[PDB]
């Protein structure tokens, strides 16, 4: 009904960030008033400009003076922009409020029924499914989505319905900021732990997160994953309402995964449903336009996530019919010729080793369907120190594809380690490989190796996405 009083004047420090710009595209539609600052201007400043929001280029003391009677609220992300920042300074220098961007989305989901997709990996797909899936079914939610991605899959919307679905963010502790009424959490691995220095606090986050469900509510969660069911069993003995979800039977499963299979047009699965959810028909047929296994589990997430507020689970499995996957999630870059023998190329963001297994066995499993097609991948490792822990399970996993192409670490601001680099995960590799440092010298060479019908992968969290286009190019001046 109203913006509480500290969110009536926001100024935003790195508006430019696609989740900032969703919550200042947010703020606007509610009658917020909003001023903001940005390192570079871009496409989401020029919008943002066009709604009404006063933005400076460049962070500086005096863009404070823009809103006014002065700002209510400074909003930051602790992430990106450092402490030291100007306008932080003067922020506190003049005494007013300074937040991160969890406490406004929290106020922004106030008396809304929210529906929070969280964990370690999968969030930003489940979100979407379920936002798919809800506008199917005729709703108008609000919602916030992405972050597990980078800016890929990042948007939001101010909507009429009463419902809020958003995608809550485990690597920073942003989790304990929100209030759900339905939590969804895809799994919980020995990852993200760099804010937590430990996996017993990182797993403890999610534990706080399940006591702060609202009395009543509903805690979705995917069994499958060990800490997933751990955390069921922890959030059953709490006295939580807890659907799980996975593939093993039980009489305490909410939905069950009884198969999958990919064909030609795209995959099905057979799952059955809890009693007490929908109808006594058994057995469920849910099909899905994305390739692999593992999205059949997040959509039996979003599905039950649906059913909590009240969506017909045969309506539901509709409007997940038609969810079409978001932006480097095995997102078809391009196709190079025509049929069985056409080379296809693919864009990906896994950089966990259980991410990276799924992505391939996904890709073979779509290789299956045609006529002897090669699995090639294009893996690049994101972390220095991930690299060093993890690079023989990195390796184990690429071991799936056919071949292997390894470029060097991206680094991604964290300080380079001596002895670590691509080939770190390189020598853990049993199949064809090739180290490809030299960034530019990769799209040539994978157009070299492939022959037709190859499914190609680019890999990685970093720059490896822009590989995707340079590859087809290099492919299609090889068409001679
Ligand atoms: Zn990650």
Redesign the pocket.
């Known amino acids: 009904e109203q913006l509480p009083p500290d969110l009536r004047r926001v100024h935003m420090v790195g508006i430019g960030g696609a989740g900032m710009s969703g919550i200042a595209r947010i703020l606007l539609d509610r009658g917020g008033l909003v001023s903001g600052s940005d390192a570079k201007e871009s496409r989401g400043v020029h919008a943002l400009r066009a709604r009404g929001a006063l933005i400076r280029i460049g962070h500086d003391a005096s863009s404070l003076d823009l809103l006014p009677g002065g700002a209510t609220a400074v909003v930051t992300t602790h992430a990106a922009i450092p402490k030291t920042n100007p306008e932080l300074v003067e922020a506190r220098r003049r005494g007013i409020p300074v937040v991160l961007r969890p406490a406004v989305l929290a106020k922004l989901m106030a008396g809304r029924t929210t529906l929070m997709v969280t964990g370690?990996?999968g969030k930003t797909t489940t979100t979407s499914m379920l936002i798919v899936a809800l506008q199917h079914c005729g709703l108008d939610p609000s919602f916030a989505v992405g972050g597990?991605l980078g800016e890929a899959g990042t948007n939001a919307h101010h909507g009429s319905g009463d419902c809020f679905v958003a995608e809550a963010d485990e690597?920073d502790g942003s989790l304990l900021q929100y209030t759900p009424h339905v939590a969804v959490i895809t799994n919980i691995e020995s990852?993200?732990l760099d804010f937590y220095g430990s996996v017993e606090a990182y797993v403890a986050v999610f534990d706080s997160f399940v006591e702060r469900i609202v009395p009543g509510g509903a805690l979705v969660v995917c069994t499958d994953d060990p800490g997933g069911a751990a955390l069921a069993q922890r959030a059953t003995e709490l006295g939580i309402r807890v659907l799980r979800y996975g593939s093993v039977p039980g009489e305490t499963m909410a939905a069950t995964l009884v198969s999958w299979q990919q064909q030609g047009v795209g995959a099905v699965a057979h799952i059955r449903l809890a009693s007490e959810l929908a109808t006594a028909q058994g057995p469920r047929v849910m099909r899905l336009s994305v390739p692999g296994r593992h999205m059949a589990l997040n959509a039996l997430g979003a599905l039950l996530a649906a059913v909590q507020i009240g969506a017909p689970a045969d309506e539901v499995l509709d409007g997940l019919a038609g969810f079409e996957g978001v932006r480097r999630r095995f997102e078809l870059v391009g196709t190079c010729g025509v049929g069985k023998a056409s080379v296809r190329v693919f864009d990906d963001y896994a950089?966990?080793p259980t991410?990276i297994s799924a992505t391939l066995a996904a890709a073979r499993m779509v290789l299956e369907q045609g006529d002897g097609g090669r699995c090639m991948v294009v893996f690049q490792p994101?972390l220095y120190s991930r690299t060093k822990a993890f690079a023989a399970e990195f390796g184990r996993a690429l071991n799936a594809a056919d071949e292997v192409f390894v470029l060097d670490v991206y680094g991604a601001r964290e300080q380079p380690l001596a002895g670590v680099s691509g080939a770190s995960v390189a020598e853990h590799v049993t199949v064809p490989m090739r180290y490809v440092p030299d960034f530019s010298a990769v799209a040539q060479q994978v157009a070299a190796a492939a022959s037709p019908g190859d499914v190609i992968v680019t890999m990685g969290?970093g720059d490896v996405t822009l590989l995707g286009p340079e590859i087809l190019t290099a492919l299609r001046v090889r068409a001679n």
């Open positions: 370690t990996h597990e690597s990852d993200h950089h966990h991410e994101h969290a």
